[PDB]
Design an enzyme around this catalytic site. Structure first.
Site, short mmCIF file in Angstrom:
data_model
loop_
_atom_site.label_atom_id
_atom_site.label_comp_id
_atom_site.label_asym_id
_atom_site.label_seq_id
_atom_site.Cartn_x
_atom_site.Cartn_y
_atom_site.Cartn_z
N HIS A 174 5.13 6.86 6.94
CA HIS A 174 4.88 6.49 5.57
C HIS A 174 4.37 7.70 4.84
O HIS A 174 4.09 8.73 5.45
CB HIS A 174 3.89 5.31 5.46
CG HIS A 174 2.55 5.71 6.05
ND1 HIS A 174 2.26 5.64 7.37
CD2 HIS A 174 1.48 6.30 5.44
CE1 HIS A 174 1.05 6.16 7.56
NE2 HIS A 174 0.54 6.60 6.40
N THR A 185 -6.60 6.55 7.74
CA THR A 185 -7.07 6.77 6.38
C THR A 185 -7.00 5.54 5.50
O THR A 185 -7.34 5.63 4.31
CB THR A 185 -6.27 7.91 5.69
OG1 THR A 185 -4.96 7.42 5.46
CG2 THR A 185 -6.27 9.20 6.51
N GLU A 214 -3.63 13.48 1.12
CA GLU A 214 -4.92 13.02 1.67
C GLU A 214 -5.70 14.23 2.19
O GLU A 214 -6.80 14.52 1.73
CB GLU A 214 -4.65 11.94 2.73
CG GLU A 214 -4.00 10.74 2.13
CD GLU A 214 -4.29 9.51 2.87
OE1 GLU A 214 -4.01 9.43 4.09
OE2 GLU A 214 -4.80 8.54 2.24
N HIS A 258 3.05 10.93 6.88
CA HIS A 258 2.37 10.63 8.14
C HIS A 258 3.35 10.00 9.12
O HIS A 258 3.82 8.87 8.84
CB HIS A 258 1.21 9.67 7.87
CG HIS A 258 0.08 10.32 7.15
ND1 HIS A 258 -0.87 9.63 6.45
CD2 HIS A 258 -0.20 11.64 7.03
CE1 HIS A 258 -1.71 10.52 5.93
NE2 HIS A 258 -1.33 11.74 6.27
N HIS A 295 1.76 9.11 1.33
CA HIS A 295 0.78 8.93 0.29
C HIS A 295 1.17 9.86 -0.84
O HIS A 295 1.60 10.99 -0.56
CB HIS A 295 -0.65 9.27 0.78
CG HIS A 295 -1.02 8.52 2.00
ND1 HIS A 295 -1.82 7.42 1.99
CD2 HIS A 295 -0.70 8.70 3.32
CE1 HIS A 295 -1.95 6.95 3.26
NE2 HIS A 295 -1.26 7.72 4.07
N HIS A 342 0.86 -1.22 0.00
CA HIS A 342 0.00 0.00 0.00
C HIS A 342 0.88 1.25 0.00
O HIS A 342 0.52 2.18 -0.72
CB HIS A 342 -0.95 0.01 1.24
CG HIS A 342 -1.75 -1.26 1.35
ND1 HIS A 342 -2.71 -1.61 0.42
CD2 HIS A 342 -1.74 -2.19 2.32
CE1 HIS A 342 -3.33 -2.76 0.86
NE2 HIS A 342 -2.71 -3.13 2.01
C1 LIG Z 1 -3.65 -0.09 11.57
C2 LIG Z 1 -3.37 0.22 10.15
C3 LIG Z 1 -2.03 -0.04 9.68
S1 LIG Z 1 -0.86 1.10 10.38
C4 LIG Z 1 -1.42 2.67 9.84
C5 LIG Z 1 -1.59 3.68 10.72
F1 LIG Z 1 -1.34 3.46 12.02
C6 LIG Z 1 -1.94 4.92 10.30
F2 LIG Z 1 -2.08 5.88 11.27
C7 LIG Z 1 -2.22 5.25 9.02
S2 LIG Z 1 -2.67 6.88 8.55
N1 LIG Z 1 -2.64 6.96 7.00
O1 LIG Z 1 -3.99 7.09 9.06
O2 LIG Z 1 -1.58 7.64 9.09
C8 LIG Z 1 -2.07 4.26 8.10
F3 LIG Z 1 -2.27 4.42 6.80
C9 LIG Z 1 -1.69 2.97 8.51
F4 LIG Z 1 -1.55 2.05 7.57
ZN LIG Z 2 -1.11 7.66 6.08
#
Ligand SMILES: CCCSc1c(F)c(F)c(S(N)(=O)=O)c(F)c1F
Ligand SMILES: [Zn+2]
Ligand SMILES: CCCSc1c(F)c(F)c(S(N)(=O)=O)c(F)c1F
Length: 257
Positions: A91, A195, A103, A116, A93, A61
């Site tokens: 990570h 998200t 986002e 993020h 996006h 992803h």
């Molecule tokens: C529990 C889900 C996998 S970890 C994770 C996450 F903790 C996020 F905050 C986000 S986000 N995008 O809300 O920061 C995210 F995309 C994630 F993949």
């Molecule tokens: Zn994210």
């Protein structure tokens, strides 16, 4: 089997994750004129001096840069938060084009990407129990615009060819996430969600006003990553963003102006 494609992207997620239509979903458009200045919001405290990165992973992803979260090394606190939140991973996006990828949006503006930095509330003892709580996570969001390179990003960029495809990881020690921050820590904040699936409504979002600059070449390298696994046909990892969701009378609060 959710993803970012035509057949399994954001508009489909509700069928497996019905809170996708919930009361506090993220991201949102940040109406800057309607955000409320809250003079009682504190400066954000970002304490990343002891951060210990460990590994970088292509999860199919995005890619995660992972940190040792088994002690209070890198932590976020202050700002709108109670208590202390430990950095677990960051990570991004991003888009297929520079005109998209973020986002959150700001007065409907899209940025080329969004970083993020994910932190969990130490009062819940680890990440998996934090995501079950309404104040379990604090995600620091930072917009990326294309212009001059971000030299603190290049170590991430350069390792990407080693994690091209889903499930690949590489050792990634001694990466300093301070090199991803803008100069100012002015922010907006609101209560929201993950998200991505499972879309849990556990996040205090803290979105910095000031973007960072990255070069065209840096974001081009993000777009060479693949959503597919090795030995499967190439599906470029692009447009891994969820669009803005209904605010539903939440107030966005500004630390400035
Ligand atoms: C529990 C889900 C996998 S970890 C994770 C996450 F903790 C996020 F905050 C986000 S986000 N995008 O809300 O920061 C995210 F995309 C994630 F993949
Ligand atoms: Zn994210
Ligand atoms: C062409 C094959 C798609 S099968 C499928 C799906 F359509 C989804 F929407 C999802 S979802 N609701 O998680 O996005 C899903 F998990 C799937 F497995």
């Amino acid at each position: 089997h959710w993803g970012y494609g035509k057949h399994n992207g954001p508009e489909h997620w509700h069928k497996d994750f019905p809170i996708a239509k919930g009361e506090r979903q993220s991201p949102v458009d940040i109406d800057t004129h309607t955000a409320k200045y809250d003079p009682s919001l504190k400066p954000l405290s970002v304490s990343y001096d002891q951060a210990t990165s460990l590994r970088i992973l292509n999860n199919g992803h995005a890619f995660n840069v992972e940190f040792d979260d088994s002690q209070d090394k890198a932590v976020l606190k202050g700002g709108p938060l109670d208590g202390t939140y430990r950095l677990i991973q960051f990570h991004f996006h991003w888009g297929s084009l520079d005109g998209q990828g973020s986002e959150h949006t700001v007065d409907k503006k899209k940025y080329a990407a969004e970083l993020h930095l994910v932190h969990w509330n130490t009062k819940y003892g680890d990440f998996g129990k934090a995501v079950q709580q309404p104040d379990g996570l604090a995600v620091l969001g930072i917009f990326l615009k294309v212009g001059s390179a971000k030299p603190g990003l290049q170590k991430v960029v350069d390792v990407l060819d080693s994690i091209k495809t889903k499930g690949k990881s590489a050792d990634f020690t001694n990466f300093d996430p301070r090199g991803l921050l803008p100069e100012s820590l002015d922010y907006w904040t609101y209560p929201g969600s993950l998200t991505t699936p499972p879309l849990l409504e556990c996040v205090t979002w803290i979105v910095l006003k000031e973007p960072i600059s990255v070069s065209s070449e840096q974001v081009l390298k993000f777009r060479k990553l693949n959503f597919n696994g090795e030995g499967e046909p190439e599906e470029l990892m692009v447009d891994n963003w969820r669009p803005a969701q209904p605010l539903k009378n939440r107030q966005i609060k500004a630390s400035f102006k």
